Amino acid sequence: TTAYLHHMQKGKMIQPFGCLLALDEKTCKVIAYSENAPEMLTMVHPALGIGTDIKTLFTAPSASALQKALGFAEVLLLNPVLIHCKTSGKPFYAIIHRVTGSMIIDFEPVKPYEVPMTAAGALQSYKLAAKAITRLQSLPSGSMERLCDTMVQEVFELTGYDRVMAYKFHEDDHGEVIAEITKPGLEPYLGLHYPATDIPQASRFLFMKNKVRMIVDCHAKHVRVLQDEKLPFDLTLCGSTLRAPHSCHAQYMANMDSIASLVMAVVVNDRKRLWGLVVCHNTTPRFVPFPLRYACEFLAQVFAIHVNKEIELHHHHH
Amino acid sequence: TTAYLHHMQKGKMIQPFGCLLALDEKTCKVIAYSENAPEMLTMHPALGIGTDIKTLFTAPSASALQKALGFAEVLLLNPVLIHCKTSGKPFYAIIHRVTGSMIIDFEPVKPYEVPMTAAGALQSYKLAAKAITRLQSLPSGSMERLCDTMVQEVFELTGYDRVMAYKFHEDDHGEVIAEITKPGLEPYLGLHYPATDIPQASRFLFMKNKVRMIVDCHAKHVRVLQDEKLPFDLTLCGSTLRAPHSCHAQYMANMDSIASLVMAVVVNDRKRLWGLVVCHNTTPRFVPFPLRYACEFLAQVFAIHVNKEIELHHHH
Numbered sequence: 001t002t003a004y005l006h007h008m009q010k011g012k013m014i015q016p017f018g019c020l021l022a023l024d025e026k027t028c029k030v031i032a033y034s035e036n037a038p039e040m041l042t043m044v045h046p047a048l049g050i051g052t053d054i055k056t057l058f059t060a061p062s063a064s065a066l067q068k069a070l071g072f073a074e075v076l077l078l079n080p081v082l083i084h085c086k087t088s089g090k091p092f093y094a095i096i097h098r099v100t101g102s103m104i105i106d107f108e109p110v111k112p113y114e115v116p117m118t119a120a121g122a123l124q125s126y127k128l129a130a131k132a133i134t135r136l137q138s139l140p141s142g143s144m145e146r147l148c149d150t151m152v153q154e155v156f157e158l159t160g161y162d163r164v165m166a167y168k169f170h171e172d173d174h175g176e177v178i179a180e181i182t183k184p185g186l187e188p189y190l191g192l193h194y195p196a197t198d199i200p201q202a203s204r205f206l207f208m209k210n211k212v213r214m215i216v217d218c219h220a221k222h223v224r225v226l227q228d229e230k231l232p233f234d235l236t237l238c239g240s241t242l243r244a245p246h247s248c249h250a251q252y253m254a255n256m257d258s259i260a261s262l263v264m265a266v267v268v269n270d271r272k273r274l275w276g277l278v279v280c281h282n283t284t285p286r287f288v289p290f291p292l293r294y295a296c297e298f299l300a301q302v303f304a305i306h307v308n309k310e311i312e313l314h315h316h317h318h
Numbered sequence: 319t320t321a322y323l324h325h326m327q328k329g330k331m332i333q334p335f336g337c338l339l340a341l342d343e344k345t346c347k348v349i350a351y352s353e354n355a356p357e358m359l360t361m362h363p364a365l366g367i368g369t370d371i372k373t374l375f376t377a378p379s380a381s382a383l384q385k386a387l388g389f390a391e392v393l394l395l396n397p398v399l400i401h402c403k404t405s406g407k408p409f410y411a412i413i414h415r416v417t418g419s420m421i422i423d424f425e426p427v428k429p430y431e432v433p434m435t436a437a438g439a440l441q442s443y444k445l446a447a448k449a450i451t452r453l454q455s456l457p458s459g460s461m462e463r464l465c466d467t468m469v470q471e472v473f474e475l476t477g478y479d480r481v482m483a484y485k486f487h488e489d490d491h492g493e494v495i496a497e498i499t500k501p502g503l504e505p506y507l508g509l510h511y512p513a514t515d516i517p518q519a520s521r522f523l524f525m526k527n528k529v530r531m532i533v534d535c536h537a538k539h540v541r542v543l544q545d546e547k548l549p550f551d552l553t554l555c556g557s558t559l560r561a562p563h564s565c566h567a568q569y570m571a572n573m574d575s576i577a578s579l580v581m582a583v584v585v586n587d588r589k590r591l592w593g594l595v596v597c598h599n600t601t602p603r604f605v606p607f608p609l610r611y612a613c614e615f616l617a618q619v620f621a622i623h624v625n626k627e628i629e630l631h632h633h634h
């Protein structure tokens with residue numbers, strides 16, 4: 001069963017669009033790093049390895065903000081942090097989460113001349129999502145079809161992907177594409193049913209906790225995460241924004257002409273279950289910044305509430 | 319409206335919490351500045367008329383403001399986080415346009431706020447979006463319950479001592495129809511006020527400037543100087559920093575509302591100013607632009623629900 005989960009947490013591979021550090025929960029020093037992190041974060045005991053102090057990597061407001069995060073509980077972390085590398089000023093969004101023993105930081109590059117617009121762009125992303133949420137709210141109740149069609153249209157406009165689908169899980173765990181919008185000319189997948197095994201339990205289980213997942217390029221060469229072999233626990237990457245897709249799925253995307261994807265879990269009663277996914281595909285590589293993904297998380301949460309109301313209301317009328 | 323509009327539209331006095339520049343769209347050079355701008359933005363001659371912003375700000379900052387000249391008002395995404403070239407001091411630059419001028423308000427940012435710039439913007443908008451979902455799920459039918467919820471939500475989001483819903487009657491006089499305060503404050507719930515307490519000129523400006531903040535009614539106002547070559551006065555009333563008229567400043571001091579934040583409630587935005595959400599604080603208070611921006615959208619949603627409650631009511 002869960003030889004799948006072993007590889008999906010302890011696989012130690014990330015997507016190369018960003019890099020990863022894990023810091024010790026007490027010393028704040030590097031205990032693990034992706035192999036691309038030296039070249040991404042430094043110009044260059046190298047400049048970056050096990051035991052590196054982050055005060056040597058980043059400017060003082062940047063390192064200061066990460067040191068302070070080492071003091072904050074998980075739910076109290078406000079992401080992302082805007083960080084600059086020492087000397088170069090090279091900027092990244094740092095997205096922080098905690099595992100037992102460690103603070104994990106995903107670093108996603110930002111275009112330097114866009115740094116002045118970071119707050120502006122984050123507000124605009126959430127504003128657009130918030131407007132989408134008001135349009136979901138004003139929909140007349142009583143039609144799951146209208147709700148799902150509206151949601152895929154909103155996600156399509158917000159995210160700019162080639163294809164957006166609502167993928168519903170049936171009682172037997174097989175899935176169905178129940179709503180879809182594409183750029184003109186693409187073949188539809190609307191209506192198609194797919195076996196339970198296309199989306200393994202481990203992936204469904206992960207979606208309960210990791211609610212938005214982005215794959216930038218299914219063909220990109222994955223990068224290993226190295227950790228001190230004496231670290232008294234294994235570092236899991238299930239929470240990382242950068243976690244590489246399992247090679248099977250990477251192959252699956254290749255076969256389907258989805259080079260890129262963005263997937264939002266739809267969890268009702270967040271008893272709790274995965275109702276389905278909002279699945280975005282792109283024909284070419286696609287990156288969208290963490291603020292938009294964050295705004296999409298809330299949109300998906302509101303959608304799930306409305307989904308569950310439509311279920312209740314058609315459970316009642318019958 | 320005769321006299322008031324002249325002075326308010328020119329907006330030659332600002333609050334000292336921030337500073338203002340106006341740039342000529344054609345040249346990108348300074349054509350107006352608040353008298354505190356030299357001290358705030360500098361430590362190449364003095365900042366004055368004719369100054370090139372490439373001498374005031376770091377290169378990415380100056381480029382971001384120069385790029386803003388090529389956006390229609392409606393397409394400006396605010397704020398811009400700028401750093402001063404000499405000091406490295408950070409500010410939020412809030413940009414608006416008046417014809418061929420670009421007007422920039424600069425509000426200081428604390429050094430530890432800079433790395434959390436996007437994080438704090440998302441959190442402010444997330445809190446406001448959650449407030450919006452609670453407004454939406456309110457059962458229809460009660461203007462009172464709607465306004466009560468709104469003042470509660472604004473109170474929690476903004477941290478002011480007092481939040482009121484202030485409704486304009488057909489004769490333009492006002493009534494406080496909902497209120498929440500910290501314990502011990504004197505209530506104004508239910509009180510009616512004359513139309514003249516909020517002049518037409520003020521009500522007209524709220525149609526366009528939807529959120530207005532006063533940090534400290536006692537603070538000494540700062541003059542804006544403009545290019546002597548201009549044969550007319552610039553309009554600076556779009557500024558976030560515009561100083562309150564001294565009559566209003568006195569009224570606040572009288573009332574022991576030292577600070578305020580006021581949101582316009584415009585229905586059919588039939589288009590009219592239904593009222594105001596009025597926040598007061600006993601002591602000075604500043605809230606940063608991203609939160610005020612998020613408040614603007616909360617107020618817009620509120621206005622939609624107010625007009626629904628009006629229509630549900632005219633149906634009975």
Ligand SMILES: *[C@H](C)[C@H]1/C(=C/c2[nH]c(/C=C3N=C(/C=C4\NC(=O)C(C=C)=C4C)C(C)=C\3CCC(=O)O)c(CCC(=O)O)c2C)NC(=O)[C@@H]1C
Pocket residue numbers: 004008175177189194197198199200203213214215244245246248249252261262263277279
């Ligand atoms: C390999 C032997 C098997 C397998 C494994 C597998 N699949 C996933 C994850 C996903 N598979 C998805 C399938 C679909 N996506 C679509 O667009 C459609 C239909 C139009 C289907 C049916 C989706 C979605 C996911 C989620 C991926 C994501 O974005 O996170 C995984 C986990 C991948 C990971 O590492 O997270 C694995 C191991 N898939 C197969 O087809 C075979 C049977």
Ligand SMILES: *[C@H](C)[C@H]1/C(=C/c2[nH]c(/C=C3N=C(/C=C4\NC(=O)C(C=C)=C4C)C(C)=C\3CCC(=O)O)c(CCC(=O)O)c2C)NC(=O)[C@@H]1C
Pocket residue numbers: 322326492494506511514515516517520530532561562563565566569578579580594596
């Ligand atoms: C001066 C002779 C007259 C006058 C002028 C005046 N008033 C305003 C603006 C406002 N007055 C407000 C009044 C209230 N605030 C409250 O909390 C209550 C009741 C509880 C009332 C009635 C409010 C609000 C405003 C808006 C101010 C804001 O925050 O923008 C103005 C415009 C000031 C400006 O510079 O924008 C002027 C010129 N007020 C008087 O009382 C007398 C008659």
